[PDB]
């Protein structure tokens, strides 16, 4: 389903960008 | 339109500024049934220009027709339908010849009118459908002359009421309401409704026993003459 994949991608992106160092230079 | 400044109602809202249908408010289009329509070309014109009609116009002092032979001996099957076809002409001299020939043939036809009744239904039907008052008057007068022409003619027209009577209903009740004033249209017999009523009465009188039921079936607002 498209909605499930979009929600999953957004959740993983939010998990990645939570660390400021990783947002800067990951 | 370009919106000009210092004219809008901005910041000015007031309770006093107050200013389920499957069709447009204007309603359906006027698909008129009384409108005139084009008259189809007739074979009377061709038979007159070719010269197959055994007749001539004698000028003398007034317009009459003379026949090169007695009309009791012509073939009515060939000639009677084509004169009825010319009843829907308008311009001269076709209309004069058509009416005079119809009257002369019906006047002294004899006992040979009866077999030709089934063949006259198509010109009668196609002349009345044109919604032109002059041809309607002419057809009604010819019909009145035809019913009284000979014996058993009226009884033969009863099964054909479904092809003649539809136009009769249109002008049945369209007479004039002038109150006290007298009517000058009676002298020349130019009133459609009076002709329609009197023709219906003639059709009933000569029709036999089953005339009234058929006319009532085709004209709903009818009353028995006898």
């Amino acid at each position: 389903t498209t909605r499930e994949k979009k929600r999953l991608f957004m959740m993983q992106r939010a998990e990645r960008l939570k660390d400021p160092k990783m947002r800067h230079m990951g | 339109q370009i919106l000009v400044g210092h004219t809008g109602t901005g910041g000015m809202t007031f309770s006093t500024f107050k200013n389920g249908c499957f069709g447009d408010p204007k309603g359906p289009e006027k698909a008129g049934a009384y409108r005139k329509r084009v008259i189809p070309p007739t074979e009377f014109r061709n038979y007159y220009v070719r010269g197959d009609l055994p007749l001539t116009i004698q000028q003398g002092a007034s317009r009459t027709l003379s026949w090169r032979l007695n009309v009791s001996s012509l073939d009515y099957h060939h000639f009677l339908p084509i004169f009825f076809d010319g009843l829907r002409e308008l311009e001269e001299p076709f209309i004069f010849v058509a009416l005079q020939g119809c009257y002369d043939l019906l006047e002294r036809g004899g006992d040979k009118i009866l077999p030709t009744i089934p063949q006259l239904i198509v010109p009668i039907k196609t002349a009345l459908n044109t919604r032109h008052p002059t041809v309607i008057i002419n057809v009604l007068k010819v019909l009145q002359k035809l019913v009284e022409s000979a014996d058993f003619v009226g009884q033969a027209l009863v099964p054909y009421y479904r092809q003649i009577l539809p136009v009769f209903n249109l002008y049945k009740n369209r007479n004039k309401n002038i109150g006290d004033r007298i009517d000058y249209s009676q002298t020349k017999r130019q009133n459609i409704s009076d002709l329609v009523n009197e023709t219906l009465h003639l059709l009933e009188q000569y029709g036999g026993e089953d005339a009234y039921i058929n006319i009532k079936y085709m004209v709903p607002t009818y009353e028995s003459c006898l």
Binding site: - | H6, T7, G8, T9, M12, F14, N19
Partner: protein, 238 residues
């Protein structure tokens, strides 16, 4: 929809319609009277390739009213002074002029006579100072002791006496604290005319740790700390 159509289609009576339309017209006229900024116009010597076109681009194209009421109250308190009116804030104060004269005298290593002025305020202040000095000490003040007039601020009392303001107040709004707190725009302790000081814009800097400020030349350009400081010169009255 225009205002005229709405007024004509409304349910108001005629008189109210006329009043509303007249109010709108008067507001429009008063707006026309105001100072404004001129509407921009395109330049005359503009180069080519602005009126030209291209085949693809050509294919794409489809082708009075506000009356003044100033009510006055009997016995209202005095809120003006002659001494306050004479002084101005953009120029040098009298004490600054005194220091300039003393600096010149020290530099030139000799006494320099002071300029003589015909201001009536100076004469009134000198007369009051001489009277006070004669009351305190039997002598009349000397020329050296009369230099004290320049260093002091003078004012009139309510009854017409001449005095000295010991502790002047700020010419902007300030606080007098008592059983209750109050703001005074003007107070008799003020020396200069009352005015509202200019302030710096709160949103001058970028929303972030980067050093970007708004430019001093226009309202949209930006600047940084390269060869000048843009944050100190963003003060404006409006």
């Amino acid at each position: 929809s225009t205002i005229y159509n709405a007024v004509d289609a409304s349910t108001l009576n005629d008189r109210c319609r006329t009043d509303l339309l007249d109010t709108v017209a008067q507001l429009g006229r008063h707006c026309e009277t105001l100072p404004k900024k001129a509407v921009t116009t395109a330049d005359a010597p503009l180069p080519s390739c602005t009126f030209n076109t291209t085949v693809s681009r050509s294919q794409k194209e489809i082708n009075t009213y506000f009356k003044d009421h100033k009510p006055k109250f009997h016995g209202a308190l005095r809120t003006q002074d002659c001494f306050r009116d004479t002084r101005d804030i953009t120029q040098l104060s009298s004490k600054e002029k005194d220091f300039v004269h003393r600096y010149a005298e020290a530099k030139m290593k000799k006494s320099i006579p002071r300029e003589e002025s015909d201001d009536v305020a100076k004469k009134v202040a000198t007369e009051a100072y001489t009277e006070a000095f004669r009351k305190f000490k039997g002598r009349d003040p000397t020329e050296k002791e009369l230099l004290e007039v320049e260093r002091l601020y003078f004012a009139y009392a309510d009854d017409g006496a001449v005095g000295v303001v010991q502790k002047p107040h700020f010419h902007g709004p300030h606080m007098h604290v008592s059983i209750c707190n109050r703001k005074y725009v003007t107070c008799p302790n003020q020396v200069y005319r009352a005015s509202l000081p200019a302030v710096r814009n709160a949103r001058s800097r970028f929303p972030g740790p980067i050093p970007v400020w708004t430019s001093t030349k226009n309202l949209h350009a930006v600047a940084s700390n390269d060869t000048y400081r843009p944050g100190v010169h963003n003060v404006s009255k409006f």
